[PDB]
Symmetry: C5
Subunit: 215 residues, 5 copies
């Protein structure tokens, strides 16, 4: 965490243990790629020196398979940057954006504030990219209600997947309304046939979750 | 969290990690709509800038299905406000109450103290509205004791549901006394028939929980 | 938490999040009535303004059924106080002891220090009363070793119950020695017959736990 | 926790909530007697006023059966002290060592620094004594690998027990080498027969754990 | 944790409870040897006096079997040092590197800064050595997908093992590509045969995890 000194200097303070205990808890249960982890990182990532944004992503417990796909995506993002930006004095080298060469204090210095933004942007871009592919959220069309699961659950998984897929929001909407009836368990579908009637694939989630989860 | 400066200025300090770790733990187990989460938010929501009251509701892990119904309810509450309050210089625009346009420091400023109250009021109103409909608490009449569950459990679920339903407190009372015998497992009902006798549907929970959970 | 100002004033500081995370964790697993929660509250309840002692009891996650019986016991304790103390200027009204009328700062003021003590005394008295009746600890005579449970477990449940029952300590002692053999599983009883011999119902727990849990 | 004032005075600061959350978490899972709890207490017990060393041992959740055997052992240790030390002005009375009579500030005072050491010594002595007898660690000779458990597990339980038993370290060593083959599951024993050969009861744990846990 | 005084002196501050609660949580679930614990230790080990780096390794809950193999490896590393460095005034004795003789303040002093680095280097070297042998990560060739586990899981275990084995990174790469198809469950293998075709043992994990985990 970059610390702005009273003199206006920038100093490096280690990420407080409490912050990791929050990110890690979300990481192990919801998943490292999981939207939940991405939001958490962003809330606290504003003041994090590039070096930390990478180290903290590494200190996260478990999610080893994900930390593999991500590490690859980050490398690909770096390749795009080196290709997009030919080496130049103003241009920041991939290492500077990674911050690997710099010491913690050097990363905190004002010159690398642009670098921190780029590193966070790659990490967040990478986390999102892995999520649509790793399928910890999953592929929506495939997600279907387990007989044991409540329609509230099927919706939770379906909403995650419909959100994860990189598709325009209009289409997400259609997917939420149409897929909820199609992939749902037959018993909810039957109950929705009795209540929703034709609107079964035209109704909103609010109308539907009330229909099967209630009664 | 709005910070009152010694100069009397208002500054924005990020919600401390410890606060999230408490809200999140209650969120994942009891539920985001769950009365427990609502109380927690309120205890710490007094000093939260509108922007946070929304962001913190978003950083909460899981409860994706609920975060869908809520997001809709908040939008509906905004529609009521814009309809109730025609746009005016004194009137706060929905965005100002959401705080989306403002920077964190701007939200903390004294002018938007009214906005924070309205935003908290919508969030808390929305959480309560989703709870009666999502049925994480459930529909009381439907709640019934699982043979495995103790009468203490059936009461815990029944009390949650009887509280969640938006009905006058007198009626809640009648529901607590009458429903507890009706939806309870037969074995407790038989035991209560032997001890409570006629008052089975007239007795209080204290009398009843002593009857089946004890012996 | 009442804060004694350097000027000697009393100011209200919110219960720190860490304190709740401890009380809540004990609350959900051991139980709100559970002796464990009662001890925790007492350690930190010394500096808590009456309003908090009630609000914190309410912020506790789960234990909804218990929070019902308690709320009733607290009301009964208030009825005893109003009956015991006829209204008078010196007399503190039930509301003042509850602190419902006062603002947080008003509760912290020196005048209501007596009120905080009374409120804590009712809460702790109420928690103890609910425990003997709710039977989260249970009725000792009924507690018996599940075949799966170790004699160490049966003792843990039996000791909880023998302690919970409102009986003079001499009798508790007799119950601990006699009940441990009687309600224990036959296999431990047989093993104790072989080692303890006649003293089976005269031996201490130390002698007995060594007998079945060991070998 | 005794606080050394800048003036050199000693003041009493309550054990921070974070410390309990660590001790309690270790307590409920590993066990109150468990070596793990004993080490934790010692790390933080250096600055704890006798009163706390007892109160904190009491605030620990669960382990009710253990808190019974310990309470007895502490009483026995007190009996040894009163017998060993005839009452005298220099001699500290059992109550002073327990600190029950003193207020928190009085316990923190320099005069009772010797008392805190004695109280910690009894608590730690008591915890160790209960552990060899309670058998939460268990009796080594009895510990045997469950077919499901890995040889890594059997070693974890066997090492705990061989350590718990109050025997000279030389003998512990022999027990670790000999018992590991004898109480282990036959399948590991067969595999060790194939790899260790004669040294089966002469090999070290490092050699053995590599033999069955690996391959 | 060594504290640099404003005077430039070095003072010893106890490891904050929050740090242990993070290390312990990672320790009990992922494992003490687990790469996750090693990274955590390193992030916070920079300012830890040798005495702590050992004591903290000891305060870690559970992993008793591992704490045995490690304790042996640390002793072996010490033997290498005493053999590599003949005793000399400049040479640091094994005890000084362990810090057992020194008081906490003495360890924090500047003279033993070299010792702390050596102690951390042995601990980290020891943790890595135990990991390849204990097989909490396991032997890669042996790791195979359980029918229940997802190909995402098999990859998580396989990647851990391929990383743990002390082999040059080129070979790790070949192992990741070849082993993933070979040890995977037949159903994923069949699906990969249909999609990957010949590249089944030439494809990358990104290509493969998309193939079976998706669809």
């Amino acid at each position: 965490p970059i610390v702005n000194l009273q003199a206006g200097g920038r100093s490096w303070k280690a990420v407080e243990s409490v912050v990791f205990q929050q990110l890690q808890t979300v990481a192990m249960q919801h998943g490292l790629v999981s939207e939940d982890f991405e939001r958490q990182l962003a809330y606290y990532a504003t003041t994090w020196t590039s070096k930390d944004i990478l180290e903290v992503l590494a200190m996260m417990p478990g999610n080893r398979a994900q930390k593999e796909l991500i590490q690859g995506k980050l490398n690909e993002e770096a390749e795009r940057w080196v290709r997009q930006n030919p080496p130049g004095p103003n241009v920041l080298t991939v290492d500077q954006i990674m911050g690997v060469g710099q010491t913690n204090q050097q990363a905190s210095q004002a010159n690398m504030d642009q670098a921190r933004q780029i590193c966070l942007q790659w990490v967040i871009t990478a986390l999102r990219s892995v999520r649509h592919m790793s399928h910890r959220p999953g592929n929506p069309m495939l997600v279907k209600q387990k007989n044991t699961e409540s329609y509230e659950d099927f919706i939770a998984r379906l909403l995650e997947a419909i959100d994860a897929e990189p598709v325009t929001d209009p289409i997400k909407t259609y997917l939420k309304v149409t897929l909820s009836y199609t992939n749902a368990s037959t018993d909810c579908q039957k109950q929705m046939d009795r209540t929703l009637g034709t609107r079964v694939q035209q109704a909103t989630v609010e109308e539907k979750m009330q229909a099967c989860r209630d009664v």
